[PDB]
Amino acid sequence: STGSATTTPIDSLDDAYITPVQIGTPAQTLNLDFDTGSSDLWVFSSETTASEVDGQTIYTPSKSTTAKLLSGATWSISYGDGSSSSGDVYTDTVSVGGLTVTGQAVESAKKVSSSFTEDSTIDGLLGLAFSTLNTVSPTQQKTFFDNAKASLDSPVFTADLGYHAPGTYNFGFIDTTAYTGSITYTAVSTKQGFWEWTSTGYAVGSGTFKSTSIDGIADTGTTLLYLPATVVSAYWAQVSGAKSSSSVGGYVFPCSATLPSFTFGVGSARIVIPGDYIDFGPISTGSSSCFGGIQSSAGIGINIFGDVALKAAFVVFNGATTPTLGFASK
């Protein structure tokens, strides 16, 4: 089997991407944030504290003839941005782009933190990291991909995120029309439960490539590119007037700037992030200070190849017995 679904930016900045997901019988379609940096499929629901729902579409398990309470199971998750959610668990039928999993754990939110409430466009998350990170207790649950894998034509999914445009998540096949040149594959460590890999270096604009190992995760659920402070300083030094602002919470730059590109290495191959992808717009409405899309990972404890990086590539998440990651230009 295979599946193919379109993923759409939630706003004009590509802050996140939503993909329609069918849950239950009859189908209830929710728009979920596919997140290769976590491993829980959770939704706003009929159980979510009413004051914490503001415009989201909810899953109502009592209206699904295939929903079953997973008795005794609870979940609770906290994300890198400080947001969180928690609740109980159902199993139900879940389909993405024509690919169906029966008995998928659907984690129903009883509580969500303010950032989730405030984002009316995201109805929940669909985790695509390794199932070892799943938070369900006392019986850990599998991701949608893990459940689908054996049925797939090939044990893979691909992320093809758009810049200010829709893109695609495919399951079970590699669309050879969706990228240019060849796909370069690189080793993955699953030791921390992430799609963790080592970039071979970087360049800023038309500058020379610096060969240096940068361990990090491929994370579709993180907006920005978070890299070591040395790398980030080298990038922003090429933008007149750019500076790190403690008050804002990162590097800002004059909105009148033209940003240089940023290149990262994948083996001997190179992925180029155009400068425009690094512009996240005014820090506050009407400001002439703009927020940068490349930020320091210092104090996160890990480097994160988030959407800024991933949307410059066609990315293969290869879930073979020994997982790997592939990157192609597009």
Swiss-Prot record:
It catalyses: Hydrolysis of proteins with specificity similar to that of pepsin A, prefers hydrophobic residues at P1 and P1', but does not cleave 14-Ala-|-Leu-15 in the B chain of insulin or Z-Glu-Tyr. Clots milk. GO terms for biological process: proteolysis. Keywords: Aspartyl protease, Disulfide bond, Hydrolase, Protease, Signal, Zymogen. Residues 17-328 form the Peptidase A1 domain. GO terms for molecular function: aspartic-type endopeptidase activity. Its EC number is 3.4.23.22. The keyword NADP does not apply. Disulfide bonds join 255-290. The active site is at 35, 199. Belongs to the peptidase A1 family. This is Endothiapepsin. It comes from Cryphonectria parasitica.
